Design a protein around this nucleic acid. Structure first.
Ligand SMILES: [Mg+2]
Ligand SMILES: [Mg+2]
Ligand SMILES: [Mg+2]
Ligand SMILES: [Mg+2]
Ligand SMILES: [Mg+2]
Ligand SMILES: [Mg+2]
Ligand SMILES: [Mg+2]
Ligand SMILES: [Mg+2]
Ligand SMILES: [Mg+2]
Ligand SMILES: [Mg+2]
Ligand SMILES: [Mg+2]
Ligand SMILES: [Mg+2]
Ligand SMILES: [Mg+2]
Ligand SMILES: [Mg+2]
Ligand SMILES: [Mg+2]
Ligand SMILES: [Mg+2]
Ligand SMILES: [Mg+2]
Ligand SMILES: [Mg+2]
Ligand SMILES: [Mg+2]
Ligand SMILES: [Mg+2]
Ligand SMILES: [Mg+2]
Ligand SMILES: [Mg+2]
Ligand SMILES: [Mg+2]
Ligand SMILES: [Mg+2]
Ligand SMILES: [Mg+2]
Ligand SMILES: [Mg+2]
Ligand SMILES: [Mg+2]
Lengths: 96, 67, 45, 107, 223
RNA sequence: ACGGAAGGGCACCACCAGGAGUGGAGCCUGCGGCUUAAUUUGACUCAACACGGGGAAACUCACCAGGUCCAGACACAAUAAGGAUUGACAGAUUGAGAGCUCUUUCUUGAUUUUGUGGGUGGUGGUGCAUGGCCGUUCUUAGUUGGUGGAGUGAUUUGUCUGCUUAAUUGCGAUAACGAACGAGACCUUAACCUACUAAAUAGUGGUGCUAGCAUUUGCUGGUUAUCCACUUCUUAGAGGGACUAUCGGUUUCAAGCCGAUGGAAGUUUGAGGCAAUAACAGGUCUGUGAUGCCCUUAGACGUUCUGGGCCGCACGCGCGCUACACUGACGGAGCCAGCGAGUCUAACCUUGGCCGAGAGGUCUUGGUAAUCUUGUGAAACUCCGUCGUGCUGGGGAUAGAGCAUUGUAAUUAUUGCUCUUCAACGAGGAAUUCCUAGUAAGCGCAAGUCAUCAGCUUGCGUUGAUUACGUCCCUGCCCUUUGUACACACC
């Protein structure tokens, strides 16, 4: 798609941080809850990210559920550059 | 109509068969009987049953009845 | 499936069920990465 | 050293009349089973959420109508207890299917 | 906050419906079989009735993270306030939904249409059901649509005990040709009911009298 | 399985005895037809036609006249940092304050672009490729296994002449005996509890404070807590109650049926919900991010934006509404329901006060609700008057002029009010629908839809009949008997 690196990272980064993204099917949503971009931006960004492995997508009642997968856990490691032994949804909280 | 089904009539037979001392011409007491002496899942069916294991009695008292 | 080969199905059906009882009785017992995310951007900040 | 009579109203709302009456009754004992003072379970008129629809996804056929319904049961129990018993009596007594709500105040 | 309780109780229904869905879509290869969501003090409790909870967990308990996180983000829960646990179902054999997904998954490794269903009925039986029925509908291999039935044991079909004693579930195994309809019916042995009616309403038991040894001219016992 | 053979049945989607009608009329609304840029489309006997919850001003929306966008994943290849690509102010242009496109010339920085492969979306096709759902047969009563009896066998007997029932419901007969699915049971609603447990969100009596009239103590009210009590009425928990009981006619003195008495209740107590096996090329790909295959994919069948269209009018068909009057209209006055709904991150249901003839407006207000709207003071209906049979003051079509509401927008007139205009229609040919008691019919109300719009529907209560309580004549179905060269089963 056509979107500036700024918005790509605000996605990409947030994906690595949370390890998870949800987002309602409604392009033209201006700003999406949480991430600071066009909703349309998120959906397609991820769609790409999935179509090359990396991430998994689920629908049901009008909402996308993107699950970051293990090979992606590497790809983001390249795109965000951060060193191996980084992070994801891969902590166990304090003692929760 | 009001033809009593087989379940009603089959139980009634089965009760008159093995409890003729005890039971009576009275449905009012035969009701209370059934409760103690028989497992039934509804009040309604129990009544439907007792009322007919009664009627059956009522005329045994004048002759026999096949079955 | 045709009824000419039926026996052969019902029996493989059983066997299928028999091995679904192997699974369900053998599962009735059988036998880090630190630094975080919003931290590495506050430690290299 | 605490404890003071704070005037309570526990409102009990559900679609499962067994679990509801259960949590209702078990509470009313666990009141005077330790001597409080109350006006007991007040059953509010159980109301019915009706929904009336054609069965058919489309148009064909004799026009058959089908009404689903959902029943909401609501009690309220008024208690007069101090802070200790109340908070105890709210966090426990919990039950999956019965929404418990405890207000306070004299207005 | 602040909602009508008519609106509130319906709302909670929907919430369950949307939640149950998402799981049935997300945990099929995990024998998802249902949920219940307990509203409590300080947390919202979600329990996943999946047969195979080892997968719902994951590497040091990952997945339920993603799963909560998902469920979290979506309905807007404030981290901590929503909590998921998985919980292996006590015999999948008496749970309609669990068996359709078996049936589905059977036919997707290409089991013979019967060997599939004909197996499930047999395993369900040995799980101690009172009766069980599977239908397959739609089209295999030929062009014109057929449908089969696969029953054994005992079922009833009408009135309240239906609400009481039979689990039913339709699934849609999406095949290369068109789509199959799987449709399972399990009828639980009402003897075991544990909480409810103990029998069918037709059940009329008579206690078996007593072998009297009567006669005997009066007499009385003192004490 | 079928027959344009025979014998039995069953039913107000049959008739009888009637009711109230439709068919005639005005209009409303769907369908055909015509018409058209387009008048999007599915469905055509009961089982297509106030049906797709289909009451379309935009949206919906598919159709028509026009304008943008890619939201064309991903892989290789090409291009290319000396710049792959992106965007634009003004002007021209355009319906448009769309940088669509052009002039001009800044900007952006590897996100794209060109190409092929591969995807993708689609209310595009196929319901005669499917799932699921539904409707139909079915207001029907049918389906099956155990042990036995018959047959080499598929199979049959059980599952049957009769009688009975709403029912393969039973009785009875009996090479069958005994059972299960479906029926019944069950479940929900409406009826009965001065028995039980309670209630300032239900209400009664007493007592205070208090108004009015009588005064002779009284009668009729005010007072979300001034206190005491109570649960009859209201509410919903747990119980109880009915089993066609008692008695009697009847009958194979069987199932049963009829009558009387009692009973809250005696038509399956009344009305529903659920409902076996099987069938249909029933309907729905236009509910679905359900789906195969085909089609299409950048001058798109994607999508969005502007504007028209689904309402267009020689006419055929179907559901409706209002009527033709005097059991009436009109005008004052009486004045009584039940099922409901209702506003959070928001404008829902609206009391009350004022202004306005009205519609409405404006100021405030209670309600997330047995708490407020609401006692929903609804309508038929009841009362006393006016009119007097005259197309009349019945009837209100058509139409002109004004004022208000919803909405970004009301013109092809959304709706509402006022004046005015004042049509057909004088009870409707052949035909045809619906119905058996709190039913028919009359009568309004909530709810769905809904910004606005019900002449529709789903429920509701109010007023409350006439005539059956039967039969096979009509019509439709079922059952045996029987014929078959049909079994893809008379398409
Ligand atoms: Mg049954
Ligand atoms: Mg039934
Ligand atoms: Mg007649
Ligand atoms: Mg007539
Ligand atoms: Mg348009
Ligand atoms: Mg391409
Ligand atoms: Mg191509
Ligand atoms: Mg589609
Ligand atoms: Mg079809
Ligand atoms: Mg179909
Ligand atoms: Mg067609
Ligand atoms: Mg009838
Ligand atoms: Mg033999
Ligand atoms: Mg026969
Ligand atoms: Mg009472
Ligand atoms: Mg009487
Ligand atoms: Mg067809
Ligand atoms: Mg469909
Ligand atoms: Mg139309
Ligand atoms: Mg009047
Ligand atoms: Mg004025
Ligand atoms: Mg307020
Ligand atoms: Mg006139
Ligand atoms: Mg008039
Ligand atoms: Mg309305
Ligand atoms: Mg309509
Ligand atoms: Mg023959």
């Amino acid at each position: 798609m056509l979107m500036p690196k700024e918005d790509r990272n605000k996605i990409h980064q947030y994906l690595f941080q949370e390890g998870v993204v949800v987002a309602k099917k409604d392009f033209n949503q201006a700003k999406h809850e949480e991430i600071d971009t066009k909703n349309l931006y998120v959906i397609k960004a991820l769609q790409s990210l999935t179509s090359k492995g990396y991430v998994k997508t689920q629908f049901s009642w009008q909402y996308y559920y993107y699950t970051l997968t293990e090979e992606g856990v590497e790809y983001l490691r390249e795109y965000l550059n951060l060193p191996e032994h980084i992070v994801p949804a891969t902590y166990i909280q304090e003692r929760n | 109509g009001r033809v009593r089904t087989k379940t009603v009539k089959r139980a009634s037979k089965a009760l008159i068969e093995r409890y003729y001392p005890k039971l009576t011409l009275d449905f009012q007491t035969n009701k209370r009987l059934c409760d103690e002496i028989a497992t039934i899942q509804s009040k309604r069916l129990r009544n439907k049953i007792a009322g007919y294991t009664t009627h059956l009695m009522k005329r045994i008292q004048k002759g026999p009845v096949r079955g | 499936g045709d009824d000419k080969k039926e026996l052969s199905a019902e029996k493989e059906a059983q066997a299928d069920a028999a091995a679904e009882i192997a699974e369900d009785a053998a599962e009735a017992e059988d036998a880090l990465q630190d630094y975080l995310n919003q931290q590495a951007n506050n430690q290299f900040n | 050293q605490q404890q003071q009579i704070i005037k309570i109203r526990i409102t009990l709302t559900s679609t499962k009349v067994k679990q509801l009456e259960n949590v209702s009754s078990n509470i009313v004992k666990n009141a005077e089973q330790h001597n409080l003072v109350k006006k007991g379970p007040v059953r509010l008129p159980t109301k019915v959420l009706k929904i009336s629809t054609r069965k058919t996804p489309n148009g064909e056929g004799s026009k058959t109508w089908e009404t689903y319904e959902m029943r909401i049961h609501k009690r309220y129990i008024d208690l007069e207890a101090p802070v200790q018993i109340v908070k105890r009596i709210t966090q426990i007594t919990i039950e999956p299917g019965v929404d418990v709500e405890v207000v306070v105040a004299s207005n | 906050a602040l909602i009508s309780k008519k609106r509130k109780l319906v709302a909670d229904g929907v919430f369950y419906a949307e939640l149950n869905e998402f799981f049935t879509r997300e945990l099929a290869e995990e024998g998802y079989s249902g949920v219940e969501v307990r509203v409590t003090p300080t947390k919202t409790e979600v329990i996943i009735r999946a047969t195979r909870t080892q997968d719902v967990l994951g590497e040091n308990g990952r997945r339920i993270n993603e799963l909560t996180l998902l469920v979290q983000k979506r309905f807007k829960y404030a981290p901590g306030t929503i909590v998921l646990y998985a919980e292996r179902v006590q015999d999948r054999g008496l749970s309609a939904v669990a068996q359709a997904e078996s049936m589905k998954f059977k036919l997707l490794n290409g089991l013979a249409i019967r060997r599939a269903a004909y197996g499930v009925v047999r395993y369900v039986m040995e799980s101690g059901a009172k009766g069980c029925e599977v239908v397959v509908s739609g089209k295999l291999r030929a062009a014109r649509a057929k449908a089969m039935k696969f029953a054994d044991g005992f079922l009833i079909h009408s009135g309240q005990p239906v609400n009481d004693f039979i689990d039913t579930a339709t699934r849609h195994v999406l095949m290369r040709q068109g789509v199959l309809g799987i449709k399972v019916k399990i009828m639980r042995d009402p003897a075991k009911s544990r909480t409810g009616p103990k029998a069918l309403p037709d059940a009329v038991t008579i206690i078996e009298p007593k072998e009297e040894e009567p006669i005997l001219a009066p007499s009385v016992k003192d004490y």
